Design an enzyme around this catalytic site. Structure first.
Site: not given
Length: 279
Positions: A16, A39, A69, A161, A175, A177, A200, A224, A260
């Protein structure tokens, strides 16, 4: 279970508060789930994967990760030290070449591959796909991600990015996913993270230590890196029976740490992925 001196992002997803370094999680650890990492590949021989990773598909001359990556992202999903879901099964699908590039047609084929290939795998607790990739808006790319999700796979995708609205990028803008932005160890929006209504959830994405090729490790930054935190979290929560592939993004948002993060633009969710594990 407690992992001391964990990477900050793992500690963050079970806390938290920022500024701690122990990762707490239920010992089930994603056992019985599967995560596809779509990937540059995965160096499955890395000791950190413990035999739980394998390449299942490539569109190039090798299935090996010649970039790093994909191995880094897979490590954040499920490696013993650097992973969220330390007992999940990892399946690599190499849609990106060793320079990290891939045609949308290949990426689409890879998503449709996963939607079918899960029927060839044993994943009694459920199936996740992690997509730390993207480019400009494409309805066909978004549709492929939507099909993968519809087929019964929790799809987590990088927001991008560009420090821009993710509505102009794919598959980020789909929308249906789970579109993942990036935060840093001080609970600030990562400087490069895309934003917007299509996001999301946020996960740790700045200065993320994970596996690398040549049996190594390194710290890198990006949406990523945030995406596999969320993918691994979904696998972990599905193994616990708390949610399903169709509902896991919403459940993660329901149970996130709220309000937060700093530098979240008006209209973008202020939600940070959180496992709600009570040790």
């Amino acid at each position: 279970a407690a992992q001391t001196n964990a990477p900050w992002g793992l500690a963050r997803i079970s806390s938290t508060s920022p500024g701690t370094s122990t990762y707490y999680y239920d010992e089930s650890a994603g056992q019985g789930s599967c995560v596809y990492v779509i990937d540059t590949g995965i160096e499955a021989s890395h000791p950190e994967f413990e035999g739980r990773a394998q390449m299942v598909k490539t569109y190039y001359y090798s299935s090996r990760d010649g970039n790093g990556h994909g191995t880094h992202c897979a490590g954040t999903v499920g490696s013993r030290t650097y992973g969220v879901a330390k007992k999940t099964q990892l399946f690599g699908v190499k849609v990106l070449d060793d320079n990290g590039s891939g045609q949308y047609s290949t990426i689409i084929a890879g998503m449709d591959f996963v939607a079918s290939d899960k029927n060839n795998r044993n994943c009694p607790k459920g199936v996740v796909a992690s997509l730390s990739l993207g480019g400009g808006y494409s309805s066909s790319v978004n549709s492929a991600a939507a099909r993968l999700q519809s087929s019964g796979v929790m799809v987590a995708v990088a927001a991008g990015n560009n420090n821009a609205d993710a509505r102009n990028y794919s598959p980020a803008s789909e929308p249906s996913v789970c579109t993942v932005g990036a935060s840093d160890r001080y609970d600030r929006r990562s400087s490069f993270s895309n934003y917007g209504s299509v996001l999301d959830i946020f996960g740790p994405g700045t200065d993320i230590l994970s596996t690398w090729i040549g049996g190594s490790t390194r710290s890198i930054s990006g949406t990523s890196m945030a995406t596999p935190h969320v993918a691994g979290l979904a696998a972990y929560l599905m193994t616990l029976g708390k949610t399903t592939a169709a509902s896991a993004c919403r459940y993660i948002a329901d149970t996130a740490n709220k309000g937060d993060l700093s530098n979240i633009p008006f209209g973008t969710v202020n939600l940070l992925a959180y496992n709600n594990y009570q040790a």
